[model samples]
Target: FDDSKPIYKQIVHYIHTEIVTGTYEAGDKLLSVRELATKLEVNPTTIQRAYAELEETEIIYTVRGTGKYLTEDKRRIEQLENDIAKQLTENFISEMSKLGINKEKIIAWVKKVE
Candidate 1:
């Protein structure tokens, strides 16, 4: 995870993107904290905390001694995708403004396709 944000938030966003992007389907078992800790090169505590955040968000569920999983609620998945899109759009607008482009200028660029 990058340090641009809290590692736990990064982990949460990673899973959010993975789920909404169809990389991980509903009912899929998530990697154990120990496994993800090794993969992300962070402490298990970080992964555990991130998982807890996701659990409270209702996007995933945990089974005792097993692992976390994506929820079967397609509606919630769709809603999560919408939120991600809105967030990315907001970032894009902010970046555009920082580059001296009008925030709304992106509207026309959308049809340029180049």
Candidate 2:
């Protein structure tokens, strides 16, 4: 994880990447707070914070005493993927605009991509 961002946010991003890449499937159980903290070499509280945020966003849910599981909601996952894609594209556009690249040129280059 990069030190430029909060550790908890980085953990959340890592989990999101896993979800987007299909590394963590719907209904898959997540690692316990302690286990994940150990695996990531971070404090348990940081992982807990990340998990809590994920749960709040409905990305993951916990069953009392059973453990946390990824949401099986396909629509939600697809929405998340769309949201991330939009954010990435916006960031790319913003950076390119800063370099004086126009939207027309950007679109032209994108169309040329194989």
Candidate 3:
């Protein structure tokens, strides 16, 4: 995780990446807040804040006593992945443009790398 962003937000991004990569699939139960906090060496409050935001956004839900689980809607996950991909592409393009790289050059570089 980069230090440029808040730790809580980084935690959220970590979970989102996991979901987008299919490491945590639909209806998968997430690690306990304390467990994750310990694993990340962060405070429990940070994990709680990340989990709270995820639940508020409907990406994850708590079952009262059963802990939190990812949403079961595969479409929602797919949509989220698409949204993230679009955001990343936009950022990448904007950064490259700032560096005076044209679209053609960018495409050519990508093709060469691939």
Candidate 4:
């Protein structure tokens, strides 16, 4: 949440990244706004804004007077993968370009990491 982006957007992106990495499984219940705020030591309003944005993105589903849950729809997985891949690829390309490394070298390094 300390990123240049708004706190809400950062929070939303954090949750999205977790989902993309399978840290937050589909249908899992997320921490309540108040709970999350307390845990993160942030204002409840910020947590609420994050949840609102996440819901808008269809990454989470809210039940009236209930709590937010991770989406179970298969499309969510695809969206998560696409987002995660784009982020990783952008970083990889930028860092490799700065290092003056070619694609073959990058591929070898990737395999080494694996």
Candidate 5:
């Protein structure tokens, strides 16, 4: 992040990575503001803004009587997956192009790696 992004979005992606990595699956409840703030060492107000941003983005949500949870929609998981992947993907592609690598060789190298 180079200290450019807000801490709110910082926590958002931290949670997003966990979700994409399947650490927290769909419909799983998340830590509350004070609870997570304690663990994360961030102020409660920061956590508050973080959760509020996530809630608006439809990734995490709150029920009237219940706490925040990972949305159960299967499609949203893919969306998160791609968004996470695409971030590094742009970097990889641009860096590879500078090194004169082509997509076919990249795919071949990926296959060889796996």
Candidate 6:
């Protein structure tokens, strides 16, 4: 679904969506970097980049001697909702434009979706 973006960013958004949707709860330990890399067939550094992005987004935190865990803050969920909506809207607009759909119909469809 996200072939155009960098792999690490895709991973970051994947875990972010999971966390925001309660697929990963607070205090849940994430898969090891190597394990994720192996599972996705990506470089460990790519997984590390994804983890770093998660930390930047305040979605996960790392313990010095342990692994990374999901943050419990509920406010992030709201932010995630908006972020996800914005991304979807942006992508839909881009695709619709490429398909020669006009602005008025696109706006109406968006209103319908919301």
TM-score of each: 0.81, 0.89, 0.91, 0.77, 0.80, 0.72
Question: What's model 4's overall lDDT?
Answer: 0.84
Query: How would you encode candidate 5's per-residue C-alpha lDDT over 1-114 as one tens digit per residue?
Result: 337778887888888888988999898999988899999888899888988888888899888666889999979888979887997888887888898999998777777995
lDDT of 4 by residue, 1-114 (tens): 576767777787777777887888888988899988999887899899989888887888897788889998868878778877998899988899899999899888889994
| Candidate 2, poorest ten consecutive residues by summed lDDT | 74-83
Clashing residue pairs, candidate 3? none
State the TM-score for model 5: 0.80
- lDDT score for candidate 1 against the true structure: 0.86
Query: Sorted on lDDT, highest at the top, how do the candidates line up?
Result: 3, 2, 1, 5, 4, 6
* Candidate 1 Cα misplacement greater than 4 A, ranges: 94-104, 110-114
The Cα local distance difference test for each model comes to 0.86, 0.92, 0.93, 0.84, 0.86, 0.83
Each model's Cα RMSD = 2.6, 2.1, 1.5, 2.6, 2.6, 3.8
Off by over 4 Å in 2: 107-114
lDDT of 1 by residue, 1-114 (tens): 565878888888888888987999888888998998999798899999999998998999999877788888888889899998999989988887798887457777776667
**Which pairs of residues collide in model 1?**
none
lDDT, candidate 1, at 36? 88
Clash-forming residue pairs, model 4: none
Stretches of candidate 3 off by over 4 Å are none
Q: Per-residue lDDT of 1-114 in model 2, one digit per residue for the tens?
A: 898988998999999999999998888999989999999899999999999999999999999888899999988888888998999999999998999999999898889999
List, residue by residue over 1-114, the lDDT tens digit for candidate 3: 787889999999999999999999899999999999999999999999999999998899999987999999999899889999999999999998999999999888878994
* Steric overlap count per candidate: 0, 0, 0, 0, 0, 0
